[PDB]
Amino acid sequence: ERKKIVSGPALPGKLADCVGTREESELFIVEGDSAGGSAKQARDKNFQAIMPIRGKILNTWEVSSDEVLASQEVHDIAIAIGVDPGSDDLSELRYGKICILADADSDGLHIATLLCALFVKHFPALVEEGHLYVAMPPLFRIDIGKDVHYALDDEELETILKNVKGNKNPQITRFKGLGEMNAIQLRETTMDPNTRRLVQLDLDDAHLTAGLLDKLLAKKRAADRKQWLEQKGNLADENRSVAEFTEQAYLNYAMYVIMDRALPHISDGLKPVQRRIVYAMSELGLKSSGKPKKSARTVGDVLGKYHPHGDSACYEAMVLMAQPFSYRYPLIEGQGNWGSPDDPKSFAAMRYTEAKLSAYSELLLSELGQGTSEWQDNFDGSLKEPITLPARVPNILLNGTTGIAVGMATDIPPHNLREVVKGTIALIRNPQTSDEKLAEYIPAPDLPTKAEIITPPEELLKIQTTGRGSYRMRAVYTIEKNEIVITELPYQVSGSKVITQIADQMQAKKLPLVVDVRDESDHENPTRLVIVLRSNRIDAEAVMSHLFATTDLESSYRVNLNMIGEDGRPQVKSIRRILLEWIEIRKKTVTRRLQYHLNRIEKRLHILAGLLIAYLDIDTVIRIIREEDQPKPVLMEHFNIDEIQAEAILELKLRHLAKLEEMEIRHEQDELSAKAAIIREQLENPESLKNLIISELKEDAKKFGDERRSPIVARAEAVQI
Amino acid sequence: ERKKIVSGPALPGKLADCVGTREESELFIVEGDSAGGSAKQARDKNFQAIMPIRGKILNTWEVSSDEVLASQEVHDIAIAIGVDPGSDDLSELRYGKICILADADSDGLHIATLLCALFVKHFPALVEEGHLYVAMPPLFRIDIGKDVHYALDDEELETILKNVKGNKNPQITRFKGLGEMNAIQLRETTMDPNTRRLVQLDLDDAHLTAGLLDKLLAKKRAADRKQWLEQKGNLADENRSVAEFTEQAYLNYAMYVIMDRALPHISDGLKPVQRRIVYAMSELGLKSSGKPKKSARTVGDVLGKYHPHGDSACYEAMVLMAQPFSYRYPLIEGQGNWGSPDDPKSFAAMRYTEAKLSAYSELLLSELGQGTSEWQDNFDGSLKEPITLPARVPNILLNGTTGIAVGMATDIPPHNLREVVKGTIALIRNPQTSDEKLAEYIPAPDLPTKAEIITPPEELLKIQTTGRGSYRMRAVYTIEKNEIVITELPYQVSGSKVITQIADQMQAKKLPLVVDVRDESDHENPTRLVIVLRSNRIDAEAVMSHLFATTDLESSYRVNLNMIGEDGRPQVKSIRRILLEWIEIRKKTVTRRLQYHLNRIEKRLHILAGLLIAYLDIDTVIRIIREEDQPKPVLMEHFNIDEIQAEAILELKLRHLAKLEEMEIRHEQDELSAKAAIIREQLENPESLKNLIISELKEDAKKFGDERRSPIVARAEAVQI
């Protein structure tokens, strides 16, 4: 039972009510920030009411009806519509239609599904009696000069397109947010009964509907939901079933956030914000060979052109890929306080630090302009951006990844570039290389520290073959007189925290043999934590063994090799499967690059053939250029060259044309013909394509590769007290 | 008495201690985010300790010593140095030097003064015995190719400059943040004893020092501090007095934040972030006649190039100047949900809304490229930005302003453009126009609402003449049957809140005659709040009178005409003084614009003189161009024109050169000579400069001006109950 109102306004100052016969009345539930003010101005006050809600309501799917009014938003909804949760009595229903008005993007879709869930669980009678609707946002925007048009479906788009004839070219884009519209556009597209597309939601079979919603929204269905994402994830973008509507809305929401925050793409090992940073820096000209610019410059361009979602989220992602203690192969570099292992979240603001691309980042970017990638509209349709980067190495394993969204997590450790290349080459030569044979090439992760991996070979193998498990690391130290001197910490472990843990044991009187702990790290000593013992007599190993058991000096790391595959689906994959799948991606990239270069080679040979003809009667060419007002047609007629060939001859300076050597031309012709011949056979013979990729992997491992940093070492179990 | 430590680390995991004879030891107090990691790597662990502090410590100036340890940061400092607050016993002092290492920018300066304050108030003995130092940041950065150099003073800069001879040009910039440096640069500039500039702070006369610090930091000195800012504000940017150091540091900090958040410049009525938005949009080409772009695009460019201080602060400032209910003359416009008076802070994200410059904004921007403004380096030295915009009208009064920082507040209401222009013209014709005569031209503020101003003429006058006071507004309504219908609300008043206030009185049984309150605002009815009475018999005036007394339907507004003057100082100014001071600014702007156009006119006449000579023997010109390999020297020799004149002749197409008419040339010559003549006399005769400005003001008032929106009306006092 909701709070009673007989006298006065329902929800004063929140609900903007209408003045209507309530069966003709319509309530629009909107999101406040995105469309609150605009919807109120868009509506017809005679029969349309607006209730703005700030942000998303809670997930009420598993909340008992006896308990659901505890939420204010929900209480307000029940008051607005005049129905108690869990009741089938609609005699107090205040509107004939209850309409969800939400954006077309991931957040709007999420808001829509949470509202449907509320109505399906707690007001099923309302939905069964046909009172719940969705006000569909446009599907497309169409710009024509200064004119903006919206299409709510494929028919309207075709109609719009065929009826504008004339000059301007129509730019079509996918519609995102209602907040982009003025009140007139919003009225015309979503609120006016004559022109909107208002879809009535059907409960259908209430048991199947509940079953589907259980899967989307219930905690106990976590496993079902994960399997659903792994099967259907690639599919993420009048009457309609509520089950069909919410399944597709929530699929779209879930895949968006999972790809945004959690799982990178297998092809280049990146998530969108990371890919957009690297791409944006490439366009800014921030090559490793030049000067860095303030990080702000890159952030501003990312925010303005590619990833408009908060300066902080962009900059924090930049920092991570600049920290040499975080990224095994930094994508970014430059002067500034990028923080330290003591606290990787404490770093200078983006107006101070400076950033350009690292040389390593060439492995992702160098082939971008060579017809290798697919491109898509950026968020507002004014630019294109690459969907994936044409990686020359499996950066996914080299820098790894971490994140979680909607219960789906990933935890990929970094690996050594040279070991991974050896493994990849083996897999290209023999796809049936076993998991165990692969482990000889790639024994373990390789972290940006010289600390030790102490996990046994057979546990490392199980992690690699199943894509999940755990490994352990220990700090590295030596003994000097009465001092334990630690020079290397486990990955992601803070020296300051370690010192705090040890000091705490000292104060708790648990470490009598330790008299002091000092942080002696400085420029001469990157990491230098000193544990001072009572005397030279004390058994340091025994002290260290206890510390390994009780502090971060020994640490454990979850591994979950989860990512978006070439098929667009999330999946946990073995090391072997990751590399096999990556190889197949690289074959496609290289094939496309070869095709791009062949075309260019052929165009250049065509020019050279013209230049050879020109050179072989240079005096006539020169005479024609000197004495003709229109040399081009004269050259074409008298030498039998085409327009392209003639323009190239005319392109040259008279001075250059005199300097034109036959030998030079003929050499380039020969050199280009032999290149084109090699390319054609690489394109036609799969085995020589494989050899090309192998030789390129070898050169890249030589140029950009480095030695293992984290030795794999067996240790006696840590012993406490 | 601080917590005691005899055994173990002092401040484990925070203080990175050194291993030194403590009189040779040095403690560096740094800000954690900006230089925490870098300072630890920069130091020499043998004699330098680092204590990072997150953000600014509290102002301890007026905290009793018996109470000051309650703060953890302060407690930590006392432990680190080994001295109790309020004690002169330095026998436990743990370091010979305590060094403040802070940035050179406004935040660093603020941090430095708060630390000095702490030490002067609570550890005066330490300062008196010469133990407190400041590690000076660089004054200048110098870029030379890929090389970065720092100078800690004017001497070092001169030395650096004279010893690089060769190719590259040195770019010199003002140094801001230590967070821009890598550890090696930080060591070399601030920490290494051989190369740093470490300044010892002197207490001097402790009574005068306390007196100065009282003024900077004590609550009871608010009035003194305000006067100090008003007198010295324009001045905001080995041994040194602590009083001199902190006065200049705090002056720099205070003026920075006051100009950033609170007081706009009189010249164009803007603060930096606003000026940077308008300038950035101008450079983006966002003219009012073209298409808008997503707000994100502008925000990203502002963040990346001009105002790198958070996407939110930039975008919120944009929104304000786009809202037609907030800005009397919007600087920005475009489709999207920019929010509403119901809640001006609820609006769609920057990836959705669209923004370009309004036509009005031409009044600030149109003369920017005509030699009118002073320019300065942007934050990182890579671009220039205007210090002020060359306003054609006193936008300061037209859109007004609001904000506060360090106790210094401003509250300027918007005014009507045409009334202000009439006043300004009167003041140009007669600077002795009285405050009272001015009030005939400018009776009152003019708000973006048709609500009423009910403040009497003599109170309006006092506000204008003193620059401070208060005015009041009332909602506007009509009576229809038994309904009160409100169509206009006071400036900045929310309809939703009003409805809430009225509903509250209803529930509290304080409004028996009111039976309902409805928000009927829609597109046909921008504002339409309906109060429903029991019957047609009821005296609505009496109900409205009570509502005016008890709700926002009548509101009051503080006025404080505070701004940065042409002299760079804050000051509260009368309307008369504002306009007189603005007029003087506009004279300088126009003088410079005239000079810019005169130069261009003269250059063009010089070209035309050459073209006339060429035209008067066109056949020879053509022959020369046809038959000479180097026509330019031949034209110069045979026609006696200079290189500039000859290039212009050759610039023309042969086709254009044939189309060259004598008449056309001679007309432009005549037209340009008469323009130049008018300009020279405007430059030489102050009275004709005044006439020019008046006529321009008249045209601008016609094009961009509009009628008063808020009528000034006398009302009977509101009567409650």
Side-chain angles (χ1 to χ4, degrees), chain A residues 40 43 105 180 187 335 337 342 352 519 521 523, chain B residues 40 43 105 179-180 187 335 342 352 519 521 523:
Chain A
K40 209 178 115 197
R43 76 174 170 145
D105 63 15
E180 84 160 42
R187 180 181 268 168
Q335 81 173 55
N337 177 31
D342 278 330
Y352 308 117
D519 188 350
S521 310
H523 184 69
Chain B
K40 209 178 115 197
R43 76 174 170 145
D105 63 15
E180 84 160 42
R187 180 181 268 168
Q335 81 173 55
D342 278 330
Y352 308 117
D519 188 350
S521 310
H523 184 69

PDB file of all heavy atoms in Angstrom, chain A residues 40 43 105 180 187 335 337 342 352 519 521 523, chain B residues 40 43 105 179-180 187 335 342 352 519 521 523:
ATOM      1  N   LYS A  40       9.395  18.236 -20.750  1.00  0.00           N
ATOM      2  CA  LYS A  40       8.315  19.054 -20.210  1.00  0.00           C
ATOM      3  C   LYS A  40       7.845  20.110 -21.223  1.00  0.00           C
ATOM      4  O   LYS A  40       6.646  20.390 -21.337  1.00  0.00           O
ATOM      5  CB  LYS A  40       8.723  19.716 -18.895  1.00  0.00           C
ATOM      6  CG  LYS A  40       7.532  19.955 -17.972  1.00  0.00           C
ATOM      7  CD  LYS A  40       7.934  20.575 -16.640  1.00  0.00           C
ATOM      8  CE  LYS A  40       7.334  21.952 -16.533  1.00  0.00           C
ATOM      9  NZ  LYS A  40       7.999  22.762 -15.485  1.00  0.00           N
ATOM     10  N   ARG A  43       5.910  18.222 -24.349  1.00  0.00           N
ATOM     11  CA  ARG A  43       4.645  17.535 -24.129  1.00  0.00           C
ATOM     12  C   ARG A  43       3.456  18.440 -24.427  1.00  0.00           C
ATOM     13  O   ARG A  43       3.613  19.655 -24.565  1.00  0.00           O
ATOM     14  CB  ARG A  43       4.544  17.176 -22.664  1.00  0.00           C
ATOM     15  CG  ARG A  43       4.204  18.417 -21.839  1.00  0.00           C
ATOM     16  CD  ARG A  43       3.945  18.092 -20.393  1.00  0.00           C
ATOM     17  NE  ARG A  43       3.846  19.304 -19.581  1.00  0.00           N
ATOM     18  CZ  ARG A  43       3.035  19.429 -18.537  1.00  0.00           C
ATOM     19  NH1 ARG A  43       2.241  18.415 -18.199  1.00  0.00           N
ATOM     20  NH2 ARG A  43       3.019  20.559 -17.832  1.00  0.00           N
ATOM     21  N   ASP A 105      21.169   4.788 -26.552  1.00  0.00           N
ATOM     22  CA  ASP A 105      22.499   4.270 -26.243  1.00  0.00           C
ATOM     23  C   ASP A 105      22.484   3.378 -25.011  1.00  0.00           C
ATOM     24  O   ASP A 105      21.428   3.138 -24.415  1.00  0.00           O
ATOM     25  CB  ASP A 105      23.544   5.389 -26.099  1.00  0.00           C
ATOM     26  CG  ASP A 105      23.250   6.329 -24.945  1.00  0.00           C
ATOM     27  OD1 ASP A 105      22.417   5.998 -24.070  1.00  0.00           O
ATOM     28  OD2 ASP A 105      23.864   7.414 -24.915  1.00  0.00           O
ATOM     29  N   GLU A 180      20.273  15.378 -27.181  1.00  0.00           N
ATOM     30  CA  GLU A 180      20.777  16.179 -28.282  1.00  0.00           C
ATOM     31  C   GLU A 180      19.686  17.013 -28.955  1.00  0.00           C
ATOM     32  O   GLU A 180      19.975  17.906 -29.755  1.00  0.00           O
ATOM     33  CB  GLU A 180      21.430  15.279 -29.315  1.00  0.00           C
ATOM     34  CG  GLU A 180      20.467  14.662 -30.290  1.00  0.00           C
ATOM     35  CD  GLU A 180      21.184  14.204 -31.537  1.00  0.00           C
ATOM     36  OE1 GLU A 180      22.295  13.633 -31.407  1.00  0.00           O
ATOM     37  OE2 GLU A 180      20.658  14.433 -32.647  1.00  0.00           O
ATOM     38  N   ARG A 187       9.396  16.581 -29.256  1.00  0.00           N
ATOM     39  CA  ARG A 187       7.960  16.474 -29.521  1.00  0.00           C
ATOM     40  C   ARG A 187       7.623  15.697 -30.808  1.00  0.00           C
ATOM     41  O   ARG A 187       6.826  14.750 -30.782  1.00  0.00           O
ATOM     42  CB  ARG A 187       7.346  17.869 -29.590  1.00  0.00           C
ATOM     43  CG  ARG A 187       5.858  17.861 -29.853  1.00  0.00           C
ATOM     44  CD  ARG A 187       5.316  19.278 -29.942  1.00  0.00           C
ATOM     45  NE  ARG A 187       4.842  19.788 -28.655  1.00  0.00           N
ATOM     46  CZ  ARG A 187       4.542  21.066 -28.416  1.00  0.00           C
ATOM     47  NH1 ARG A 187       4.676  21.972 -29.381  1.00  0.00           N
ATOM     48  NH2 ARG A 187       4.119  21.445 -27.210  1.00  0.00           N
ATOM     49  N   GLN A 335      58.346  13.004 -20.034  1.00  0.00           N
ATOM     50  CA  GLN A 335      58.762  13.514 -18.747  1.00  0.00           C
ATOM     51  C   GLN A 335      57.553  13.874 -17.881  1.00  0.00           C
ATOM     52  O   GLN A 335      56.491  14.283 -18.376  1.00  0.00           O
ATOM     53  CB  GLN A 335      59.734  14.700 -18.903  1.00  0.00           C
ATOM     54  CG  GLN A 335      59.099  16.059 -19.180  1.00  0.00           C
ATOM     55  CD  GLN A 335      60.124  17.198 -19.139  1.00  0.00           C
ATOM     56  OE1 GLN A 335      61.135  17.171 -19.848  1.00  0.00           O
ATOM     57  NE2 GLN A 335      59.871  18.193 -18.304  1.00  0.00           N
ATOM     58  N   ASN A 337      55.885  13.460 -13.483  1.00  0.00           N
ATOM     59  CA  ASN A 337      55.674  12.562 -12.379  1.00  0.00           C
ATOM     60  C   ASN A 337      54.512  11.636 -12.721  1.00  0.00           C
ATOM     61  O   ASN A 337      53.357  11.983 -12.515  1.00  0.00           O
ATOM     62  CB  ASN A 337      55.394  13.345 -11.093  1.00  0.00           C
ATOM     63  CG  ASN A 337      55.090  12.437  -9.922  1.00  0.00           C
ATOM     64  OD1 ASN A 337      55.600  11.314  -9.858  1.00  0.00           O
ATOM     65  ND2 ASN A 337      54.243  12.904  -8.995  1.00  0.00           N
ATOM     66  N   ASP A 342      55.004   2.688  -5.222  1.00  0.00           N
ATOM     67  CA  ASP A 342      54.544   2.981  -3.861  1.00  0.00           C
ATOM     68  C   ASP A 342      53.070   3.323  -3.875  1.00  0.00           C
ATOM     69  O   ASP A 342      52.352   3.019  -2.931  1.00  0.00           O
ATOM     70  CB  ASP A 342      55.306   4.153  -3.240  1.00  0.00           C
ATOM     71  CG  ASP A 342      56.644   3.747  -2.656  1.00  0.00           C
ATOM     72  OD1 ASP A 342      56.786   2.591  -2.210  1.00  0.00           O
ATOM     73  OD2 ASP A 342      57.556   4.599  -2.634  1.00  0.00           O
ATOM     74  N   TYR A 352      50.568  19.089 -16.430  1.00  0.00           N
ATOM     75  CA  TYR A 352      52.012  19.065 -16.180  1.00  0.00           C
ATOM     76  C   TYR A 352      52.756  17.957 -16.917  1.00  0.00           C
ATOM     77  O   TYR A 352      53.784  18.214 -17.540  1.00  0.00           O
ATOM     78  CB  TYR A 352      52.322  18.930 -14.693  1.00  0.00           C
ATOM     79  CG  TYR A 352      51.634  19.935 -13.802  1.00  0.00           C
ATOM     80  CD1 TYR A 352      50.728  19.514 -12.843  1.00  0.00           C
ATOM     81  CD2 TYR A 352      51.892  21.295 -13.914  1.00  0.00           C
ATOM     82  CE1 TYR A 352      50.094  20.413 -12.017  1.00  0.00           C
ATOM     83  CE2 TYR A 352      51.262  22.210 -13.078  1.00  0.00           C
ATOM     84  CZ  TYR A 352      50.368  21.751 -12.130  1.00  0.00           C
ATOM     85  OH  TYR A 352      49.722  22.628 -11.284  1.00  0.00           O
ATOM     86  N   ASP A 519      63.198   2.885   4.160  1.00  0.00           N
ATOM     87  CA  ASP A 519      63.047   2.979   2.715  1.00  0.00           C
ATOM     88  C   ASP A 519      64.229   3.799   2.225  1.00  0.00           C
ATOM     89  O   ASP A 519      64.304   5.016   2.463  1.00  0.00           O
ATOM     90  CB  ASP A 519      61.721   3.649   2.351  1.00  0.00           C
ATOM     91  CG  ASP A 519      61.422   3.609   0.866  1.00  0.00           C
ATOM     92  OD1 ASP A 519      62.313   3.227   0.074  1.00  0.00           O
ATOM     93  OD2 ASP A 519      60.284   3.966   0.492  1.00  0.00           O
ATOM     94  N   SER A 521      65.164   3.840  -1.045  1.00  0.00           N
ATOM     95  CA  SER A 521      65.053   3.974  -2.488  1.00  0.00           C
ATOM     96  C   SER A 521      65.416   5.406  -2.884  1.00  0.00           C
ATOM     97  O   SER A 521      64.985   6.365  -2.241  1.00  0.00           O
ATOM     98  CB  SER A 521      63.638   3.622  -2.950  1.00  0.00           C
ATOM     99  OG  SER A 521      63.231   2.378  -2.402  1.00  0.00           O
ATOM    100  N   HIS A 523      67.689   7.585  -6.583  1.00  0.00           N
ATOM    101  CA  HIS A 523      67.981   7.393  -8.011  1.00  0.00           C
ATOM    102  C   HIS A 523      69.024   6.306  -8.259  1.00  0.00           C
ATOM    103  O   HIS A 523      68.915   5.536  -9.214  1.00  0.00           O
ATOM    104  CB  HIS A 523      68.396   8.688  -8.708  1.00  0.00           C
ATOM    105  CG  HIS A 523      68.609   8.526 -10.182  1.00  0.00           C
ATOM    106  ND1 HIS A 523      67.573   8.283 -11.062  1.00  0.00           N
ATOM    107  CD2 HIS A 523      69.738   8.555 -10.930  1.00  0.00           C
ATOM    108  CE1 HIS A 523      68.056   8.171 -12.286  1.00  0.00           C
ATOM    109  NE2 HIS A 523      69.367   8.333 -12.234  1.00  0.00           N
TER     110      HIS A 523
ATOM    111  N   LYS B  40      61.185  11.217  -4.319  1.00  0.00           N
ATOM    112  CA  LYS B  40      61.848  10.089  -3.674  1.00  0.00           C
ATOM    113  C   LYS B  40      62.982   9.526  -4.545  1.00  0.00           C
ATOM    114  O   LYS B  40      64.042   9.143  -4.036  1.00  0.00           O
ATOM    115  CB  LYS B  40      60.850   8.988  -3.317  1.00  0.00           C
ATOM    116  CG  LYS B  40      61.283   8.187  -2.094  1.00  0.00           C
ATOM    117  CD  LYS B  40      60.273   7.115  -1.704  1.00  0.00           C
ATOM    118  CE  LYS B  40      60.899   5.756  -1.882  1.00  0.00           C
ATOM    119  NZ  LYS B  40      59.878   4.683  -1.923  1.00  0.00           N
ATOM    120  N   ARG B  43      66.069  12.271  -4.685  1.00  0.00           N
ATOM    121  CA  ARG B  43      66.833  12.586  -3.486  1.00  0.00           C
ATOM    122  C   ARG B  43      68.091  11.732  -3.382  1.00  0.00           C
ATOM    123  O   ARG B  43      68.237  10.742  -4.101  1.00  0.00           O
ATOM    124  CB  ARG B  43      65.992  12.244  -2.278  1.00  0.00           C
ATOM    125  CG  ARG B  43      65.965  10.731  -2.065  1.00  0.00           C
ATOM    126  CD  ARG B  43      65.265  10.342  -0.791  1.00  0.00           C
ATOM    127  NE  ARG B  43      65.051   8.898  -0.716  1.00  0.00           N
ATOM    128  CZ  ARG B  43      65.095   8.203   0.415  1.00  0.00           C
ATOM    129  NH1 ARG B  43      65.366   8.828   1.558  1.00  0.00           N
ATOM    130  NH2 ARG B  43      64.865   6.891   0.404  1.00  0.00           N
ATOM    131  N   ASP B 105      53.213  27.492  -9.293  1.00  0.00           N
ATOM    132  CA  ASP B 105      51.897  28.020  -9.643  1.00  0.00           C
ATOM    133  C   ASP B 105      51.043  28.265  -8.409  1.00  0.00           C
ATOM    134  O   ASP B 105      51.489  28.052  -7.276  1.00  0.00           O
ATOM    135  CB  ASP B 105      51.159  27.129 -10.655  1.00  0.00           C
ATOM    136  CG  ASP B 105      50.855  25.744 -10.115  1.00  0.00           C
ATOM    137  OD1 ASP B 105      50.946  25.523  -8.884  1.00  0.00           O
ATOM    138  OD2 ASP B 105      50.520  24.866 -10.934  1.00  0.00           O
ATOM    139  N   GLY B 179      55.631  18.683 -11.211  1.00  0.00           N
ATOM    140  CA  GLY B 179      55.127  17.418 -11.719  1.00  0.00           C
ATOM    141  C   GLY B 179      55.434  17.223 -13.190  1.00  0.00           C
ATOM    142  O   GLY B 179      55.234  16.149 -13.740  1.00  0.00           O
ATOM    143  N   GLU B 180      55.936  18.259 -13.842  1.00  0.00           N
ATOM    144  CA  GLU B 180      56.312  18.113 -15.237  1.00  0.00           C
ATOM    145  C   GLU B 180      57.704  17.502 -15.413  1.00  0.00           C
ATOM    146  O   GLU B 180      58.086  17.108 -16.518  1.00  0.00           O
ATOM    147  CB  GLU B 180      56.268  19.465 -15.926  1.00  0.00           C
ATOM    148  CG  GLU B 180      57.510  20.290 -15.744  1.00  0.00           C
ATOM    149  CD  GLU B 180      57.610  21.354 -16.811  1.00  0.00           C
ATOM    150  OE1 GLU B 180      56.564  21.974 -17.129  1.00  0.00           O
ATOM    151  OE2 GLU B 180      58.718  21.557 -17.351  1.00  0.00           O
ATOM    152  N   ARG B 187      65.958  16.421  -9.342  1.00  0.00           N
ATOM    153  CA  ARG B 187      67.235  16.409  -8.625  1.00  0.00           C
ATOM    154  C   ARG B 187      68.141  17.610  -8.955  1.00  0.00           C
ATOM    155  O   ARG B 187      68.610  18.313  -8.049  1.00  0.00           O
ATOM    156  CB  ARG B 187      67.977  15.109  -8.921  1.00  0.00           C
ATOM    157  CG  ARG B 187      69.310  15.002  -8.216  1.00  0.00           C
ATOM    158  CD  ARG B 187      70.010  13.703  -8.578  1.00  0.00           C
ATOM    159  NE  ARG B 187      69.703  12.613  -7.653  1.00  0.00           N
ATOM    160  CZ  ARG B 187      69.998  11.330  -7.876  1.00  0.00           C
ATOM    161  NH1 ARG B 187      70.603  10.973  -9.005  1.00  0.00           N
ATOM    162  NH2 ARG B 187      69.678  10.399  -6.976  1.00  0.00           N
ATOM    163  N   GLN B 335      21.213  23.123 -30.482  1.00  0.00           N
ATOM    164  CA  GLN B 335      20.202  22.170 -30.082  1.00  0.00           C
ATOM    165  C   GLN B 335      20.702  21.283 -28.940  1.00  0.00           C
ATOM    166  O   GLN B 335      21.898  20.975 -28.826  1.00  0.00           O
ATOM    167  CB  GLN B 335      19.708  21.340 -31.284  1.00  0.00           C
ATOM    168  CG  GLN B 335      20.586  20.161 -31.693  1.00  0.00           C
ATOM    169  CD  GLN B 335      19.927  19.294 -32.772  1.00  0.00           C
ATOM    170  OE1 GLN B 335      19.542  19.787 -33.837  1.00  0.00           O
ATOM    171  NE2 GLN B 335      19.787  18.008 -32.494  1.00  0.00           N
ATOM    172  N   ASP B 342      13.498  25.221 -13.957  1.00  0.00           N
ATOM    173  CA  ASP B 342      13.103  24.292 -12.894  1.00  0.00           C
ATOM    174  C   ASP B 342      14.331  23.767 -12.182  1.00  0.00           C
ATOM    175  O   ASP B 342      14.293  23.510 -10.986  1.00  0.00           O
ATOM    176  CB  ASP B 342      12.314  23.100 -13.439  1.00  0.00           C
ATOM    177  CG  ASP B 342      10.847  23.411 -13.657  1.00  0.00           C
ATOM    178  OD1 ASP B 342      10.291  24.259 -12.932  1.00  0.00           O
ATOM    179  OD2 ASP B 342      10.244  22.788 -14.556  1.00  0.00           O
ATOM    180  N   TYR B 352      26.180  14.948 -26.120  1.00  0.00           N
ATOM    181  CA  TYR B 352      24.885  15.084 -26.795  1.00  0.00           C
ATOM    182  C   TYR B 352      24.561  16.504 -27.246  1.00  0.00           C
ATOM    183  O   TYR B 352      24.156  16.709 -28.388  1.00  0.00           O
ATOM    184  CB  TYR B 352      23.740  14.598 -25.913  1.00  0.00           C
ATOM    185  CG  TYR B 352      23.914  13.211 -25.346  1.00  0.00           C
ATOM    186  CD1 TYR B 352      23.998  13.021 -23.976  1.00  0.00           C
ATOM    187  CD2 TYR B 352      23.986  12.096 -26.172  1.00  0.00           C
ATOM    188  CE1 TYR B 352      24.151  11.764 -23.438  1.00  0.00           C
ATOM    189  CE2 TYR B 352      24.132  10.822 -25.636  1.00  0.00           C
ATOM    190  CZ  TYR B 352      24.208  10.672 -24.265  1.00  0.00           C
ATOM    191  OH  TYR B 352      24.355   9.425 -23.697  1.00  0.00           O
ATOM    192  N   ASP B 519       1.496  22.193 -12.546  1.00  0.00           N
ATOM    193  CA  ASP B 519       2.485  22.722 -13.475  1.00  0.00           C
ATOM    194  C   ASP B 519       1.966  22.396 -14.866  1.00  0.00           C
ATOM    195  O   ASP B 519       1.955  21.226 -15.284  1.00  0.00           O
ATOM    196  CB  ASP B 519       3.854  22.084 -13.231  1.00  0.00           C
ATOM    197  CG  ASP B 519       4.962  22.725 -14.041  1.00  0.00           C
ATOM    198  OD1 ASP B 519       4.666  23.549 -14.935  1.00  0.00           O
ATOM    199  OD2 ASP B 519       6.139  22.398 -13.778  1.00  0.00           O
ATOM    200  N   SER B 521       3.167  23.941 -17.647  1.00  0.00           N
ATOM    201  CA  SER B 521       4.129  24.440 -18.616  1.00  0.00           C
ATOM    202  C   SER B 521       4.297  23.403 -19.728  1.00  0.00           C
ATOM    203  O   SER B 521       4.408  22.206 -19.460  1.00  0.00           O
ATOM    204  CB  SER B 521       5.467  24.735 -17.937  1.00  0.00           C
ATOM    205  OG  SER B 521       5.272  25.532 -16.780  1.00  0.00           O
ATOM    206  N   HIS B 523       5.024  23.454 -24.531  1.00  0.00           N
ATOM    207  CA  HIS B 523       5.608  24.296 -25.585  1.00  0.00           C
ATOM    208  C   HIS B 523       4.761  25.529 -25.891  1.00  0.00           C
ATOM    209  O   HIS B 523       5.292  26.613 -26.135  1.00  0.00           O
ATOM    210  CB  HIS B 523       5.892  23.521 -26.870  1.00  0.00           C
ATOM    211  CG  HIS B 523       6.571  24.345 -27.922  1.00  0.00           C
ATOM    212  ND1 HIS B 523       7.872  24.787 -27.797  1.00  0.00           N
ATOM    213  CD2 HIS B 523       6.124  24.824 -29.108  1.00  0.00           C
ATOM    214  CE1 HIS B 523       8.198  25.499 -28.861  1.00  0.00           C
ATOM    215  NE2 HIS B 523       7.154  25.536 -29.673  1.00  0.00           N
TER     216      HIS B 523
END
